[PDB]
Amino acid sequence: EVAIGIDLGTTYSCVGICRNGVVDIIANDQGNRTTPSYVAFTDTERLIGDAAKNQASRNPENTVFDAKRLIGRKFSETTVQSDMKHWPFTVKGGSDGKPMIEVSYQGEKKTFHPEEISSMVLKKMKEVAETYLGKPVKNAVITVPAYFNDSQRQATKDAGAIAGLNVLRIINEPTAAAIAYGLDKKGKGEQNILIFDLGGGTFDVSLLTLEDGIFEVKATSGDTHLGGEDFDNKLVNFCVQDFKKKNGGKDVSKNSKSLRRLRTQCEKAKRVLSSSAQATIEVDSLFDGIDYNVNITRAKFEELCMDQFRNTLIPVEKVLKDAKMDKSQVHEIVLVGGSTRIPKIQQLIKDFFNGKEPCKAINPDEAVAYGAAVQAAILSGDQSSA
Ligand SMILES: Nc1ncnc2c1ncn2[C@@H]1O[C@H](COP(=O)(O)OP(N)(=O)O)[C@@H](O)[C@H]1O
Ligand SMILES: [Cl-]
Ligand SMILES: [Cl-]
């Protein structure tokens, strides 16, 4: 009977439930409404979510993330060759051509397929919902990017089955975000919807059309390597150079642990800058026992990221061109992904659409799970959201 909606994200995952026409996004054990898509293996335990992300800098080799970049892919694919430079964990090709993620767990070498790693994240989201409901959950709707091919969709479904979920349906992330805002119901005539999704690792722009409760993905574009982690890297690179000028040319980038600790504080300051004009980046005993401290204004962060922020409009122009439509024909602009909280990004999109206010009432990192939860309730026979 009970069906949940799960956004299985590249960096963060989110679970929601739609009951009595309303959607609850469920907080995990730490009170977090989203959970890192991380799995770590130690000498004693298997950690998932917050606990896995929290010890990533201390156990880089055995902390797995980005399994969504590998799911349903052949190891020989050029995207795997390119992405693997970003991973401290080992990935090798099996005899069937499938990627095998290699870690040490309890002093033993273990290998996992990407869908096994994703099944552990899905199982954690299932348990987050179960703790909240006080009852077992079997049914789920899971979302995937619109560009996911048959192999990536099937492997995501398999990850659900391994997690103990009966996958009612795999639906597109941009469509789930549009469903969250009731744009399928409120719009009787044709509606052109632009989904602007900027997360932690990827940027997806999708142009949808909705005529008579039916959504069609007309055009998609974006950048699979543009997200919040790239804005954090702009702050990291600046701090590395700032440390050099302060401490006689000493180079923090030569120590990978120093970089990881600096990156963690850079991402925190970045979040603060979405609601304050300034933030402090502080790392005690960063490199060579030297303490590091710097103040970053929102203007300086905007300057370091200026080109990356402005270039988010290029895939917007591309989808409009592919769909053969003018920006004036877009009825709604939906902001999805945690990076859409950046004020400069919101301003750039608004100005591009000639002052049109984007739909951002739903927490942008929750809108996909929210829509998946609505769809899961509908597929279970509950018409209360409609
Ligand atoms: N307040 C905030 N301002 C700027 N960036 C923010 C933010 N809150 C979250 N983020 C960013 O959102 C990214 C994760 O977005 P999310 O939509 O949850 O993840 P995902 N798996 O879909 O990529 C991270 O880079 C994080 O720093
Ligand atoms: Cl339900
Ligand atoms: Cl409840």
CATH number of the domain encompassing residue 259: 3.90.640.10
Strand-pairing partners, residue 17, are: 24
User: Rounded to whole angstroms, how far apart are CA atoms 205 and 220?
Assistant: 6
User: Rounded to whole angstroms, how far apart are CA atoms 217 and 195?
Assistant: 10
Strand-pairing partners, residue 287, are: 290
Ramachandran class of 72: left when φ > 0, alpha when ψ lies in -120 to 50, beta otherwise: left
Length of the chain: 386
Tokens, residue 296 = 């970053």
The atom of ligand 1 lying closest to the CA of 227 is 25
Please say whether the beta carbons of 223 and 252 come within 8 A: no
User: Rounded to whole angstroms, how far apart are CA atoms 202 and 224?
Assistant: 5
Instruction: Count Cα atoms within 13 angstroms, Cβ side, for 217.
Output: 18
Give the neighbor-by-neighbor strand order of the sheet with 63-64: 46-48, 39-41, 63-64
Describe the crossing of helices 114-133 and 150-162 by its angle, rounded to 10 degrees. Answer: 50
Distance 195 CA to ligand 2 centre (A): 26
Pairing status of strand 139-144 against strand 166-172: parallel
Resolution of the determined structure in angstroms stands at 2.2
Residue range(s) defining the domain that contains residue 270 = 228-303
Please say whether the beta carbons of 368 and 143 come within 8 A: yes
Tokens, residue 102 = 């290699």
Q: Return the residue whose CA atom lies nearest to atom 27 of ligand 1.
A: 228
Is 7 one of the catalytic residues? yes
Sign of the CA dihedral running 47, 52, 54, 56: positive
**Of 130, 189, 125, which Cα lies nearest the Cα of 331?**
189
Residue pointed to by tokens 């030569």: 254
DSSP for 252-274?
Answer: GGG-HHHHHHHHHHHHHHHHHTT
- As to burial, measured by CB atoms within 10 angstroms (0-12 exposed, 13-18 middle, 19+ buried), residue 10 is buried
User: Rounded to whole angstroms, how far apart are CA atoms 375 and 6?
Assistant: 11
| Identity of the residue numbered 205 | V
Distance 205 CA to ligand 3 centre (A): 35
**What are the distances in angstroms from CA 141 to CA 122, 157, 367?**
11, 10, 14
Tokens, residue 323 = 């769909």
DSSP for 118-174?
Answer: HHHHHHHHHHHHHHHHTS---EEEEEE-TT--HHHHHHHHHHHHHTT-EEEEEEEHH
Helix (H/G/I), strand (E/B), else coil: 301:
helix
Please say whether the beta carbons of 377 and 3 come within 8 A: yes
**What are the distances in angstroms from CA 31 to CA 17, 28, 80, 132, 247?**
16, 5, 34, 11, 40
| Identity of the residue numbered 191 | Q
The atom of ligand 1 lying closest to the CA of 273 is 3
Q: Return the residue whose CA atom lies nearest to atom 2 of ligand 1.
A: 271
The atom of ligand 1 lying closest to the CA of 198 is 17
User: Rounded to whole angstroms, how far apart are CA atoms 241 and 237?
Assistant: 6
**Residues in CB range of 94: below 8 A, 6 or more apart:** 75, 100, 113
**What are the distances in angstroms from CA 240 to CA 160, 263, 264, 281?**
41, 10, 14, 12
Please pick, among 158, 173, 229, 366, the residue that the annotation labels catalytic.
173
Residues making up the binding site for Mg(2+): 7, 12
Is 68 one of the catalytic residues? yes
User: Rounded to whole angstroms, how far apart are CA atoms 200 and 7?
Assistant: 14
Tokens, residue 97 = 């051509």
Closest ligand to residue 343's CA:
1
Please say whether the beta carbons of 64 and 89 come within 8 A: yes
**Of 10, 41, 56, 24, which Cα lies nearest the Cα of 110?**
41
Is 197 one of the catalytic residues? yes
The atom of ligand 1 lying closest to the CA of 272 is 1
What are the two backbone dihedrals, phi and then psi, of residue 26, each rounded to the nearest 5 degrees? -90, 120
- As to burial, measured by CB atoms within 10 angstroms (0-12 exposed, 13-18 middle, 19+ buried), residue 362 is buried
Please say whether the beta carbons of 149 and 186 come within 8 A: no
User: Rounded to whole angstroms, how far apart are CA atoms 62 and 244?
Assistant: 31
**Residues in CB range of 153: below 8 A, 6 or more apart:** 72, 144, 170
Tokens, residue 74 = 């052949």
Is 173 one of the catalytic residues? yes
Helix (H/G/I), strand (E/B), else coil: 222:
strand
User: Maximum CA pair distance of the chain?
Assistant: 67
Residue pointed to by tokens 């963690």: 264
**Of 234, 232, 217, 230, which Cα lies nearest the Cα of 312?**
230
Residue pointed to by tokens 């989201």: 125
Q: Torsion angle of alpha carbons 374, 369, 342, 195, nearest 10°?
A: -60
**Of 40, 57, 49, which Cα lies nearest the Cα of 110?**
40
Pocket (CB within 6 angstroms of ligand 1): 9-12, 34, 199-201, 227-229, 267, 270-271, 274, 337-339, 341-342, 365
DSSP for 185-207?
Answer: HH--S-EEEEEEEE-SS-EEEEE
User: Rounded to whole angstroms, how far apart are CA atoms 298 and 65?
Assistant: 29
Closest ligand to residue 368's CA:
1
Pocket residue to mutate for ligand 1, from 203, 234, 271, 368, most atoms within 8 A of Cβ: 271
User: Rounded to whole angstroms, how far apart are CA atoms 39 and 41?
Assistant: 7
Tokens, residue 342 = 């950046």
Closest ligand to residue 27's CA:
3
Q: Would you give the distance in Å from CA 27 to the centre of its chain? A: 17
Please pick, among 50, 66, 68, 184, the residue that the annotation labels catalytic.
68
